[PDB]
Design a protein around this ligand. Sequence first.
Ligand SMILES: Nc1ncnc2c1ncn2[C@@H]1O[C@H](COP(=O)(O)OP(=O)(O)OP(=O)(O)O)[C@@H](O)[C@H]1O
Ligand SMILES: Nc1ncnc2c1ncn2[C@@H]1O[C@H](COP(=O)(O)OP(=O)(O)OP(=O)(O)O)[C@@H](O)[C@H]1O
Ligand SMILES: Nc1ncnc2c1ncn2[C@@H]1O[C@H](COP(=O)(O)OP(=O)(O)OP(=O)(O)O)[C@@H](O)[C@H]1O
Ligand SMILES: Nc1ncnc2c1ncn2[C@@H]1O[C@H](COP(=O)(O)OP(=O)(O)O)[C@@H](O)[C@H]1O
Ligand SMILES: [Mg+2]
Ligand SMILES: [Mg+2]
Ligand SMILES: [Mg+2]
Lengths: 379, 379, 379, 379
Amino acid sequence: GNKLFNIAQRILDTNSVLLTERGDHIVWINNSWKFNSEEPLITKLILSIRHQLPKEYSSELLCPRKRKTVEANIRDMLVDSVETDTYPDKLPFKNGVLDLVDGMFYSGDDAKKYTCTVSTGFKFDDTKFVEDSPEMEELMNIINDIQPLTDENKKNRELYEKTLSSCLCGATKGCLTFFFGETATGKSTTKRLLKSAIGDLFVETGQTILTDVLDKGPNPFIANMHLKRSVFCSELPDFACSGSKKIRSDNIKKLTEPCVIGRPCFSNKINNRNHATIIIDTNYKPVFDRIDNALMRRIAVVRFRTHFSQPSGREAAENNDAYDKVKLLDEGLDGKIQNNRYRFAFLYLLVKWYKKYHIPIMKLYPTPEEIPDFAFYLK
Amino acid sequence: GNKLFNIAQRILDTNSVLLTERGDHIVWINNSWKFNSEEPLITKLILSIRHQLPKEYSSELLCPRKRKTVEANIRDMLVDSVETDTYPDKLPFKNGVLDLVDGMFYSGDDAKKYTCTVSTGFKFDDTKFVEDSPEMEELMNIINDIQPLTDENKKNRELYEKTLSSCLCGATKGCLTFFFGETATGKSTTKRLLKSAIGDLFVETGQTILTDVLDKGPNPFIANMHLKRSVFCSELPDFACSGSKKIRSDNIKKLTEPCVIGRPCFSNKINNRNHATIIIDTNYKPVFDRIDNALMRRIAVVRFRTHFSQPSGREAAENNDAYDKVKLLDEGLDGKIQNNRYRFAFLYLLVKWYKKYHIPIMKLYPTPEEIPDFAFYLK
Amino acid sequence: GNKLFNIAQRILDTNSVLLTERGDHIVWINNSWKFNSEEPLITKLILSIRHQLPKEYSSELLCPRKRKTVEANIRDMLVDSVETDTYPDKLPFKNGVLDLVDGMFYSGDDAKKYTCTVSTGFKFDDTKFVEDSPEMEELMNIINDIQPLTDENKKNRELYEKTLSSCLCGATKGCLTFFFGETATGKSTTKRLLKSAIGDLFVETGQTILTDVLDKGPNPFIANMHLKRSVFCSELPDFACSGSKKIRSDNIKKLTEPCVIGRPCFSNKINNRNHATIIIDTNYKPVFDRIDNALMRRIAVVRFRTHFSQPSGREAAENNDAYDKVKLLDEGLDGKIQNNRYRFAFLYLLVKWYKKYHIPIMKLYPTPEEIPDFAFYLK
Amino acid sequence: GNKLFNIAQRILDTNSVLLTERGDHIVWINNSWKFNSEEPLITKLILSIRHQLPKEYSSELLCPRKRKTVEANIRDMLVDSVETDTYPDKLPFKNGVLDLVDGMFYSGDDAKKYTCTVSTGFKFDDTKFVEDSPEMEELMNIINDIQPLTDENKKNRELYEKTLSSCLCGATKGCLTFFFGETATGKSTTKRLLKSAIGDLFVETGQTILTDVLDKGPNPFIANMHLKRSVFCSELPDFACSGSKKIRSDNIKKLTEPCVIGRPCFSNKINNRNHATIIIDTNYKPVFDRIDNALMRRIAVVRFRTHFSQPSGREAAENNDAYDKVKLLDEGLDGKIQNNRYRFAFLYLLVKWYKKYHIPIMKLYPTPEEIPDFAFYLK
DNA sequence: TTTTTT
Ligand SMILES: Nc1ncnc2c1ncn2[C@@H]1O[C@H](COP(=O)(O)OP(=O)(O)OP(=O)(O)O)[C@@H](O)[C@H]1O
Ligand SMILES: Nc1ncnc2c1ncn2[C@@H]1O[C@H](COP(=O)(O)OP(=O)(O)OP(=O)(O)O)[C@@H](O)[C@H]1O
Ligand SMILES: Nc1ncnc2c1ncn2[C@@H]1O[C@H](COP(=O)(O)OP(=O)(O)OP(=O)(O)O)[C@@H](O)[C@H]1O
Ligand SMILES: Nc1ncnc2c1ncn2[C@@H]1O[C@H](COP(=O)(O)OP(=O)(O)O)[C@@H](O)[C@H]1O
Ligand SMILES: [Mg+2]
Ligand SMILES: [Mg+2]
Ligand SMILES: [Mg+2]
């Protein structure tokens, strides 16, 4: 019958268009699933895939109204919804998905059955994903400077590696990590390194998600954690002064389930999938309002005890108590981190740690033996 | 006359399009009633049903403009409205509806008179609906290790079975159930098992539906309860501190009526049908602003008294009063629960329980003798 | 000359389309005046009336574009508006209009001169409108159980009958009736019986109209009171505690006028005709911010003093003060009420009460000898 | 084959239209990367570029329908997102981008590869960018008057020059500078000079961003800092009064990060780029809530020691202990400053200073030894 | 303030 109907049937046969649960129409272009709500991408996919059709059918696919007719025919054939993000050991990129169980990097048709929606936003460069490189040497030097691998800092180093590496798998975690340390110790440098490593799967929200009710009214901070694999809560304010609200234990206990409750502005969606590895950048000891067994089993803390300073404050840092080693500060480090110099090296280090630690199963274990408030309860 | 008008008349003769009370246009495709408020589905139904018409009539159902013309013709014939979800003991799936009185599964045109708008979303596979299976044995062991069938725990076990089986019927209930218990006991595991069992007929709202006014302004947390067969209000906070809002008895009174008043954003419809078995996952025993007879007969409480722990703190938990039986924590249990492995077995168990308990008639009976606050008013 | 203009003139000459003061376009199809905002029914009317036209004109009336053109022609002829709903003693049904002065039921064009906009939503069947029937006996027994016809309960019985029967007349009532009583007495049963009786002339709204202003912003809770003949506001909160807002006498005084000010979303029509009988289901004596004689002549109270109980707690209820009679609860009553078993019987009883009471003139009256707050001002 | 498709290809491959990460389209007309979300400038670009095509292609760019078709065809070719504002050493004007490495100024296609979004708002005129001019001499006299270049005031002079010159590059600053001085000293003079120099890349808001939280509710002051290169904080109230708000340290720590978290009204985007130099205009010694080493490395203070007054209080100014030199006040300065008589002269001075100081890298240093509150902790 | 708008 109609020629454009055959075009729609052929586009549907290759299985490039899917109907999601939320009602969006995800397409498959440039080896990455993409979607949008205000402007659907069906016509973009049609024009892109034009080339893979027979000769007499390609020339028919240039007039915009014919493309619109093909899209209208396509939209009348998608009746069944398909769920997304069911594989929790994959790291999708802009040109494929990097498998984590064995380090292979699929692309094209091979990297298609893993229906991943979110993506890092940048392509994968296999040349720089090699272990031996000067960038790897510099990165290893920096990592060892931040967390020295001595015997007194063994369990701390293992916890640091495990927590940092947990930011790759897209599963649900069950513990919160506190980056405790003094001033100018390396927390923000680690944050920026991780952000450059994973890219789009990393958001930074405010402290409001910890001490305020997250049910009444809109709360876009909760709504922006949808399908993210890492969330940072930086600069926790001190509580030694008055007027500062305590950390609600209910909020912590509500941030470790596969579905958190919260809605964005002007919308009615109230369910958010929770794949986030929540890390809190603090400067002082945290204080809570209620303490019980249900809270002490969901808290972990790693300590940074290496101070980077200038020659001016060398004697001040040497005689301090919160530091165990003093090192020379560097100026170009903060400069060339944003330029994505240690990106692929850190990615390789993270995947190596992931395959070393979480290969059978991924899980985080609380360490409540470090907080004095919980040390009192260790009765 | 116009051949398109004949097409519309033939489509209407098959009784596939219906005009519901709220003003939607439900269709009948893939053995399930579907509807969407944003985009109509009449064109999809026309395209899908083009096959059941003579050969000369099929060729006109290909051009989208003709399909829109037929949709416009159909929309000007539905004058009289009908109501949906009149039978409360039928479970609608994505490819049929399963009867609950005798376990018979209907499909096709036979499963059409029961106008069930809602659906679980996943198809029915009778090959996995049998009693003999290793999955059934594992699920039975898990259930018996969560709520043991000893003599001391007989009434609690039967109340647990009754409450869980009540999540299948499609009529109004009259009791709120609290899943009271200590930490690491088996509450969230039961919640996730039920979610895997009943699929999409299971929503999770915040605690604002309990300690806040649900009338003024928008409130999608109430508007999403429309025709839901189960509702969870998880993770209740403690009320022994300051500024802790008590549970308003007015909300509890309202949540047990056939109509719950509340509207979503950008809409005018304010009435919502209530089919939900409200279950609250709490950790401390609740306290209300006032206690009276009208609140005495609308609350039931079950107890979970089996702690799961790792060999680390085994003796620390064995020396506690809050537990009656200590077992070993299993890691992969949640991993294979999220994969929907114990879905159909638990569905079969739920059907068996419902047929054992509520087959003559369905009702829930309160247990007010569990709350010390309620105990004082009868002391 | 033109042809579609002749068809439009013929349609208008039959006097089937009218323009209201609010600016709507009411349509006379299937023996009922219908109207809707989202979907204009003029095309539906054209398609329905196609049958009573000359044959050479009927075939022209099948293309949707031609129907749209005829609708556009019709919309440009209605220059003068016509008032609606001026007869206050008519009950409009889905298949005609039932009189309330002599019990006769008109149909067809005879029941067209009464411009009735709203409708009950269900058809009228004279087969079940008889006096002798087992359902009538059951309903009479239930009514006598809820309100015994004793000498001490004589005035309350007649006030209850008058208040229930006042929900049929489409005029303005200047009194608010309170359903004051203790738990498990039968207020909800009466509400459900009334709802099954009248049908769509019954709206339930939240308590936000009694404790919050009804002017600021959109307020569909008040905007849905337009031409509704009954309004119920159950689950009245207690006020003995702190933080409970008292009932504003301003709202009560404003709700007793033939025009309440309130607007729905997406509209500018802020005038609402009040034909409702406001009834409140309460369990405590209501309180207000201030008490005055102007609030005295608008409030009436009936008392429910028949506790229904299961055999488990028969003795405890028998030893109570706030009850005068204890009976056995029936589980199937609420189940079979939802099936509209006692619909036409209660309709006939209400018609009989209306013919007995309000035939000369209809007016509600206050009983200020019930509320202790008002008894203070009578001291 | 097709003819408009080749036109769209020619428009695309010349790299004139680009897609941003937020979903908007930026075009290139009038030598500026302007964009509008409501008015698409694609048609304007097509009609402007029609001159650079063969004579047989121009005739098809006259019908508005054909230009709309070309726009629609172009919109279906932008698949990959492009990030903007990556070069931190380019100052964008309205008619081109001025480089800072060598002082050369580009325009047209040259100043196009640098995807600059924001702009100063005024055109660049090379004829007024000379080194010798009466405006240069008057401006140099003013600058030497406000900050005398004595050996007692050498470090302060160069620190002032560095802080002023830092307001050109688009990197991320890491220090806050206090323009602490007495009244009528010349702080507003420098503010107005800078505002005339850089124009649109300069905003001034209230002091609330220093004594308030930055997470609760909306914060339009944060959304105003997006891609701004200089922020001036004036009208700082005295703190030695009663109940005066204290400068919150947490705001200072959160205001020096590459991304500040905060959402504007009615919006959901919570991330913001921090390219702005923060200069605070106080009058007295600032007091904070808490002093710690984390606040020691984010504070810089310059001193103004030249008072201006009329001969009225000449002896009072000459005898005051807080000044170092007093001169005669001028009235026409604020007249010709608002007429931008010292616009390009100050710009050239700023460019010279930037080339002198921050040509290898950009970095601002703190100076903790200028406030006694910070001299207390020398122990 | 948001929602409502628009
Ligand atoms: N391995 C390293 N080698 C050289 N310099 C380093 C190294 N790690 C960090 N630095 C530098 O030392 C400083 C450490 O800053 P850091 O990231 O600890 O700050 P922060 O966590 O934001 O501080 P605070 O807790 O005071 O707010 C930075 O100037 C950084 O460039
Ligand atoms: N029968 C079983 N055998 C072994 N492990 C089990 C069994 N049932 C549950 N578990 C595991 O024991 C743990 C119990 O955790 P659960 O989700 O029940 O906690 P919870 O009731 O939500 O806790 P809290 O009150 O602290 O929030 C889970 O890891 C679950 O997988
Ligand atoms: N005549 C009757 N005989 C037997 N049972 C009856 C009779 N009338 C009502 N009932 C039953 O008694 C119960 C009355 O409960 P109902 O919901 O009417 O109480 P209520 O007064 O609204 O309660 P509350 O104010 O506490 O919410 C229902 O189960 C109803 O079916
Ligand atoms: N170098 C100068 N030469 C002439 N007049 C000056 C000079 N510096 C400041 N003034 C005059 O002093 C007046 C007030 O100075 P102002 O910039 O307001 O000081 P502050 O910023 O401390 O309030 C201005 O109107 C300006 O004309
Ligand atoms: Mg840092
Ligand atoms: Mg739990
Ligand atoms: Mg009630």
